[PDB]
Write an enzyme that holds these catalytic residues in place. Structure first.
Site, PDB file in Angstrom:
ATOM      1  N   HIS A 257       0.849  -1.183   0.000  1.00  0.00           N
ATOM      2  CA  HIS A 257       0.000   0.000   0.000  1.00  0.00           C
ATOM      3  C   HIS A 257       0.891   1.241   0.000  1.00  0.00           C
ATOM      4  CE1 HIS A 257      -3.401   2.491   2.034  1.00  0.00           C
ATOM      5  NE2 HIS A 257      -3.563   2.471   0.723  1.00  0.00           N
ATOM      6  N   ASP A 274      -4.216   9.077  -0.052  1.00  0.00           N
ATOM      7  CA  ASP A 274      -4.311   7.629  -0.260  1.00  0.00           C
ATOM      8  C   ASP A 274      -5.197   7.470  -1.483  1.00  0.00           C
ATOM      9  OD1 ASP A 274      -4.717   4.874  -0.177  1.00  0.00           O
ATOM     10  OD2 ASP A 274      -5.281   4.839   1.944  1.00  0.00           O
TER      11      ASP A 274
END
Ligand SMILES: Cn1nc2c(=O)n(CC3(O)CCN(Cc4ccc(-c5ncon5)cc4Cl)CC3)cnc2c1-c1ccc(CN)cc1
Ligand SMILES: Cn1nc2c(=O)n(CC3(O)CCN(Cc4ccc(-c5ncon5)cc4Cl)CC3)cnc2c1-c1ccc(CN)cc1
EC number: 3.4.19.12
Lengths: 343, 343
Positions: A257, A274
């Site tokens: 991630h 994000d």
């Protein structure tokens, strides 16, 4: 967008660190303004990387929905997961900044990239027993800091400028002087207004014959004094640096991630980016929580790239951008595209 | 010395009246200064091209620590004698200068900067009382001339400006097909620009001497000026609140009197007096109340022109300027200039 005033970038396939880098560059306001100034009139929309970056930046500044990048990735050719696995983040930065610097040649903003990003170092080799020395000045746009065995950025920089011995079998080929014992080192002549530091968070492990991630703890400060790593300091402008962006990777592999923390105005008010989700976060979430886990915990979330801005240049680098910094021509060009798409 | 204030003066070279005052006023219109630097003055002649002459005065105002000369600038637009300035009002010289640079900014990244900064819209109507006829004229404006004789302050001037005038009796309106009619004449403001140029009518033709005389009456102007009530339609998303930036002043009854300008260049209420080559810090009272003009009980020193900046646009209009805002090309051209005469 109104939560924070900042809009995200779409997750469009697995592009790893791309979205993180794009936000980092977008919020280098002086670079952004220079990019809007590029003369992309005659450029073809699908092939021009400079126009595509203008487009991403324009959408980041004006869209209230998450921003796409497919025209950007098409334009510089990395359309598959493999392209990003086989390049480091700084290589993508070089691809993008090289394109726009070339497009800025001959314009009012020529030389913006070097002035923001490139510093000067000297690498030397000095022979102990004979009178021979070799010097080579070198330009750099980023710095790769060793972390393994180091506790913090200061120790990484100490390691970076440390004198290394070339003796025994290591002996330096000194040409007409034969093999000699010598010490090899590097010194910083200048540091740029915008400092790109990548951390060596993968290391080649012979055991697997492949690279593995280093998850060790490694600290970096909000404020970074670097005067002691210059060859000659300037009393009129100390090399004091202020943390702008923390590029973060969670996991052990390219399937992990990727996120970026920034305080875009340099005021210590941080947000987490994000992909399409941007949210305000604590300073601790941006800095200390990305130091990486220490041996006891038995944590793969940690920084691999930091951006610092020279104190003396912060207000110039982070100068506000208004939509009158986007030429009407480009505005009309991009707005025409939106009309074509929406019908 | 320029270090007193950080600002440098303009040389007193003959009798150019309000010119030096207006040049400082425009130079500290930072957004306009940056656009001027962005102009493509490659092939024009230094003594013939007004856009190059402005760049050069601005460049020297920004960099020189000695007073800045203007002969090349006055020569480029033709006003070489005290008569040339005596025959024009301040806003006419402003119009001459802004016209040259706006024309030069066509086709460039900063095209339209002059209208965006300085142009508002008004509509002038004549309405017939007793027949169905109305004549409407939309108009652009770049400056406003306010009547002061008989008005106590700027608000009363604006009340006067938009006041309805009766056309009846001997001044009836020629309504064409409808013959002579009684009607009401008026003006309404549609928009007010980010940078508001207000000339005060401080010279009136007097029948007693059959010539113009100066009116030295007291006329008050505020540091903050709300104008919403003079807009035909107001905008709750941007109130027409204005911030005083400059006060152009005249002392004497004569074109042979003394012209100076007071500015707070950063818009922060820290004022300086620009007295040709001498720039000094001054109090807010010396910039504002001291230039209202002697109240009869008792002074021929007073303001003839004010610059206001819209609150919502101040940080954009007054955005700081670095030397990176000046293209390296232009810097070289002006530096070659300076070396030729230095020798
Ligand atoms: C030694 N070194 N380490 C580096 C590093 O980490 N970065 C950050 C990334 O470019 C790379 C890692 N990702 C995250 C990530 C993805 C997948 C795995 C993984 N997959 C399977 O196993 N592990 C592990 C990780 Cl950390 C973030 C971007 C950049 N340069 C690095 C260098 C280097 C030093 C000198 C030169 C010559 N000047 C060139 C390069
Ligand atoms: C009525 N009106 N007054 C004006 C005015 O004052 N200004 C400021 C100056 O342009 C003029 C005055 N000087 C100072 C000055 C010099 C010499 C004597 C003098 N010498 C002997 O006698 N008198 C007196 C003085 Cl105050 C500073 C610059 C500009 N426009 C003005 C207008 C006007 C109104 C509508 C239109 C159509 N839109 C056009 C013009």
């Amino acid at each position: 967008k109104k939560h924070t005033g900042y809009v995200g970038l779409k997750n469009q396939g697995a592009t790893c660190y791309m979205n993180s880098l794009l936000q980092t560059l977008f919020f280098t306001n002086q670079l952004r303004k220079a990019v809007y100034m590029m003369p992309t009139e005659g450029d073809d929309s699908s092939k021009s990387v400079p126009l595509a970056l203008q487009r991403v930046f324009y959408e980041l500044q004006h869209s209230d929905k998450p921003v796409g990048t497919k025209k950007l990735t098409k334009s510089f050719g990395w359309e598959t997961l493999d392209s990003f696995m086989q390049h480091d983040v700084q290589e993508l930065c070089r691809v993008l900044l090289d394109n726009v610097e070339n497009k800025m040649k001959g314009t009012c903003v020529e030389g913006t990239i070097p002035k923001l990003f490139r510093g000067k170092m000297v690498s030397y080799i000095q022979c102990k027993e004979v009178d021979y020395r070799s010097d080579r000045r070198e330009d750099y746009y980023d710095i790769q800091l060793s972390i393994k065995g180091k506790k913090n950025i200061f120790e990484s920089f100490v390691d970076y400028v440390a004198v290394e011995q070339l003796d025994g079998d290591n002996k330096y080929d000194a040409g007409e002087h034969g093999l000699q014992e010598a010490e090899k080192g590097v010194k910083f002549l200048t540091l740029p207004p915008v400092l790109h530091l990548q951390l060596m968070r993968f290391m080649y492990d012979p055991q697997t014959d492949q690279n593995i991630k280093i998850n060790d703890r490694f600290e970096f400060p909000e404020q970074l004094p670097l005067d002691e790593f210059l060859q000659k300091t300037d009393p009129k402008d100390p090399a004091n640096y202020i943390l702008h962006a923390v590029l973060v990777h969670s996991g052990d592999n390219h399937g992990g991630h990727y996120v970026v923390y920034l305080n875009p105005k340099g005021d210590g008010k941080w947000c987490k980016f994000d992909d399409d989700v941007v949210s305000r976060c604590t300073k601790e979430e941006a800095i200390e929580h990305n130091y990486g886990g220490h041996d006891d915990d038995l944590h793969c979330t940690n920084a691999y790239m930091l951006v610092y801005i020279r104190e003396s240049k912060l207000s110039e680098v982070l100068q506000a951008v208004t939509d009158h910094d986007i030429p009407q021509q480009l505005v009309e060009r991009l707005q025409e595209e939106k009309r074509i798409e929406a019908q």
